[PDB]
Ligand SMILES: *[C@@H]1O[C@H](CO)[C@@H](O[C@@H]2O[C@H](CO)[C@@H](O)[C@H](O)[C@H]2NC(C)=O)[C@H](O)[C@H]1NC(C)=O
């Protein structure tokens with residue numbers, strides 16, 4: 129998978145075989161780093177109207 | 179491929195925007211109704227039937243709510259009803275007497291005049307009733323004596 | 328800015344049309360936004376595809392504009408029904424509906440035309456100068472209680488009058504301003520006084 | 526089944542028989558109305574073409590779709606703000622109830638603001654608030670009037686109604702004992718005022734019972 | 748503010764009628780030497796009604812006020828030639 133966002137230390141407990149998270153509205157939410165066995169939350173980068 | 183995707187996403191956005199516009203028109207109608215209710219119901223006393231709760235309206239109290247309003251309608255409802263004999267007028271001395279504000283009633287023996295929305299009998303006097311015509315016209319006139327104070 | 332409500336409407340319509348016109352300047356994926364150029368530059372085999380793209384785009388723009396017009400026409404129909412109801416129950420009569428025909432107590436209304444709209448001059452009555460008074464719901468005279476027919480009892484400190492409730496018009500308390508009911512052991516707040524009998 | 530419209534009830538009509546009520550009830554009903562939506566706003570460029578220059582270049586061919594969509598959503602948000610403003614902001618001033626609650630026996634403590642409360646909301650207001658329950662170009666603009674301000678507006682309207690009747694709407698607020706205001710209202714419904722004063726305690730108790738029943742209904746049924 | 752970051756606006760404590768709405772109870776406006784200020788909009792001057800169980804306030808004078816209520820009635824009867832617009 130590919131995307132843009134900020135990776136942060138997560139609070140979830142992924143199963144040993146789960147890789148990619150998913151929110152309710154079919155949006156990627158967290159990922160499992162392939163090398164380090166740590167789960168990273170993907171918070172999309174800040175934006176807003178001017 | 180990106181032309182296809184852009185067309186699809188634009189169509190989805192247009193559908194969403196049209197649905198939002200229609201639902202917002204609905205909500206604007208609801209908000210106009212709520213404003214009218216607050217103006218005529220809270221700030222005053224409505225005489226429009228079933229516009230401010232079943233029964234005769236007394237008052238209202240507004241209450242906030244998330245993206246909405248809640249009216250507490252305080253209304254007056256007659257509960258306990260009695261059967262009385264009635265007449266459209268009573269004949270005293272050839273004249274026909276009609277109630278100024280109320281209706282004639284009879285518990286079988288005597289004739290009284292009561293306000294229409296609450297049984298409060300009062301002896302019939304020339305200050306409760308007004309004269310008109312004679313007793314040969316009104317269909318159903320009854321006989322009685324109009325006490326003179 | 329007073330007539331903004333009207334101006335807005337006009338502006339909106341104009342804006343819509345403008346966008347529609349500007350939608351003629353878009354290629355929508357075609358090789359040119361001018362139909363004549365595509366017809367002059369390509370043979371039918373691919374001119375048909377290009378014109379198909381242009382037609383799809385312009386048809387979508389037209390449908391969008393039509394839907395916008397329909398929704399705005401529903402808005403304006405609602406406003407027109409409101410205006411008709413106001414004219415019926417406000418000009419051709421006297422509405423007792425609170426705040427529906429101007430702030431205060433409604434006296435009358437006068438309609439005025441305006442470009443794509445109407446303007447109501449609502450003539451209303453508003454109390455201005457007010458005075459405090461001590462008041463009582465009823466008064467004993469001979470054990471019986473008297474209640475005011477129209478108006479409320481007031482006291483300027485020493486004497487008691489009966490005055491209509493929308494304009495201080497003190498009148499002596501008598502048996503033609505007040506009506507009797509029962510006795511004055513039940514009403515809460517009663518005060519003593521004499522009820523002059525004509 | 527074939528649904529029944531209602532219970533059959535023949536009226537004993539007769540040309541010389543009338544039915545007059547001898548007693549009444551003071552019933553409080555509840556009427557719920559929506560006033561506004563959530564002020565949603567969508568950024569078409571980021572939704573359609575999230576972080577993609579080529580997609581944006583292709584999208585720029587379609588003209589001014591985004592301008593009119595954003596304009597419509599902005600109009601929607603403005604309209605919601607206007608709806609809330611016109612529904613609630615109908616009192617020129619902010620009246621507040623005096624500490625004395627000598628309201629002819631009527632008890633408004635369930636609708637007046639609670640000085641010890643989360644956001645100065647009344648009991649029924651708090652019940653209503655408690656009975657009702659991202660970064661992809663979609664945002665939710667905040668309403669112009671915060672719930673505290675709407676609570677203040679309802680408090681001003683309620684205090685005006687309680688302490689002045691209807692006069693506070695027409696013009697300057699004119700105080701009046703609540704019993705006399707209810708006498709006005711009874712005169713307004715064709716029931717002479719003496720009915721009130723002779724049955725003041727009963728009417729006050731009935732109103733309190735009705736408010737309690739409304740409380741229970743709101744607390745029980747979501 | 749709860750609506751975001753505002754730059755160029757002088758934050759004052761005094762409340763005023765809302766002129767340019769920002770959000771979350773904050774409105775901005777140009778005021779006096781002159782500059783742009785953002786403030787928590789006021790709902791109106793507060794007041795207390797001297798309510799007591801045996802006190803009534805009655806008017807003695809009056810004013811006849813003519814207010815103005817504006818209502819749109821009709822749009823511009825636009826008509827579009829579909830075939831000429833699409834396929835001129
Ligand atoms: C109809 O009502 C009248 C008025 O109350 C009744 O007449 C009175 O009856 C009581 C008995 O309860 C006597 O004490 C009064 O002296 C009577 N007053 C008069 C003026 O007669 C009458 O009895 C009632 N009739 C029926 C059938 O209920």
Ligand SMILES: *[C@@H]1O[C@H](CO)[C@@H](O[C@@H]2O[C@H](CO)[C@@H](O)[C@H](O)[C@H]2NC(C)=O)[C@H](O)[C@H]1NC(C)=O
Nearest residue numbers: 481482483484485486487488489497498499500
């Ligand atoms: C309250 O009103 C009464 C009635 O007008 C006032 O009594 C009158 O006062 C005038 C003097 O201003 C005398 O000439 C009358 O003879 C009085 N009439 C009666 C029946 O007493 C009374 O003074 C007023 N009280 C106040 C405090 O203004």
Ligand SMILES: *[C@@H]1O[C@H](CO)[C@@H](O[C@@H]2O[C@H](CO)[C@@H](O)[C@H](O)[C@H]2NC(C)=O)[C@H](O)[C@H]1NC(C)=O
Nearest residue numbers: 463466467468469470511515516517518519520
């Ligand atoms: C109005 O005047 C009457 C007098 O006619 C008062 O009635 C008296 O009440 C006292 C109790 O406070 C009794 O001790 C007397 O016996 C009563 N007198 C009579 C003749 O019944 C009445 O209290 C007065 N009202 C007010 C509100 O003071």
Ligand SMILES: *[C@@H]1O[C@H](CO)[C@@H](O[C@@H]2O[C@H](CO)[C@@H](O)[C@H](O)[C@H]2NC(C)=O)[C@H](O)[C@H]1NC(C)=O
Nearest residue numbers: 257258547548549550724726727728730731734
């Ligand atoms: C009118 O109705 C009310 C309530 O239905 C009556 O008040 C009740 O009176 C009875 C006496 O028989 C008491 O036991 C109840 O506790 C009362 N209820 C309340 C809520 O106070 C009232 O008596 C009726 N009045 C008439 C004239 O019928």
Ligand SMILES: *[C@@H]1O[C@H](CO)[C@@H](O[C@@H]2O[C@H](CO)[C@@H](O)[C@H](O)[C@H]2NC(C)=O)[C@H](O)[C@H]1NC(C)=O
Nearest residue numbers: 626627630631632633634635648733736737740
């Ligand atoms: C108005 O009614 C409320 C309840 O409906 C009263 O508050 C109650 O007061 C009693 C006595 O202290 C407490 O035991 C209850 O827990 C209270 N209930 C609530 C919901 O607060 C209130 O006292 C009444 N107002 C007046 C002036 O009597």
Ligand SMILES: *[C@@H]1O[C@H](CO)[C@@H](O)[C@H](O)[C@H]1NC(C)=O
Nearest residue numbers: 144160161162163164165166
């Ligand atoms: C992958 O290799 C790194 C060092 O190159 C090591 O620290 C890490 O533990 C390895 N991960 C696994 C799952 O073997």
Ligand SMILES: *[C@@H]1O[C@H](CO)[C@@H](O)[C@H](O)[C@H]1NC(C)=O
Nearest residue numbers: 258259260261536537542544
């Ligand atoms: C009045 O009389 C009719 C029949 O004459 C009867 O059905 C009705 O119940 C009576 N009304 C009351 C309140 O009892």
Ligand SMILES: *[C@@H]1O[C@H](CO)[C@@H](O)[C@H](O)[C@H]1NC(C)=O
Nearest residue numbers: 266316317318319539540541
């Ligand atoms: C009412 O109906 C009865 C029943 O026949 C009749 O005798 C009487 O004359 C009628 N009265 C009126 C006023 O219609």
Ligand SMILES: *[C@@H]1O[C@H](CO)[C@@H](O)[C@H](O)[C@H]1NC(C)=O
Nearest residue numbers: 269270272318319320321322
């Ligand atoms: C009423 O009394 C008159 C005599 O004064 C009589 O002629 C008439 O028949 C009476 N009507 C009724 C309904 O009793």
Ligand SMILES: *[C@@H]1O[C@H](CO)[C@@H](O)[C@H](O)[C@H]1NC(C)=O
Nearest residue numbers: 456457458459796797798804
């Ligand atoms: C009535 O008395 C109160 C005292 O609490 C005062 O504030 C108010 O101004 C008085 N009314 C008028 C019209 O002056």
Ligand SMILES: *[C@@H]1O[C@H](CO)[C@@H](O)[C@H](O)[C@H]1NC(C)=O
Nearest residue numbers: 515516517625627799800801
């Ligand atoms: C009105 O309130 C006062 C206290 O300010 C009290 O003394 C008086 O008894 C009350 N009157 C009534 C009728 O409740």
Ligand SMILES: *[C@@H]1O[C@H](CO)[C@@H](O)[C@H](O)[C@H]1NC(C)=O
Nearest residue numbers: 757758759760761784785786
């Ligand atoms: C506004 O008041 C607060 C205290 O309530 C104070 O800290 C702040 O400095 C004040 N700001 C201005 C511009 O007066």
Ligand SMILES: *[C@@H]1O[C@H](CO)[C@@H](O)[C@H](O)[C@H]1NC(C)=O
Nearest residue numbers: 455456457807808809810811
């Ligand atoms: C009522 O107000 C007007 C001002 O338009 C004033 O001229 C007039 O004297 C006032 N009337 C009374 C009785 O104060």
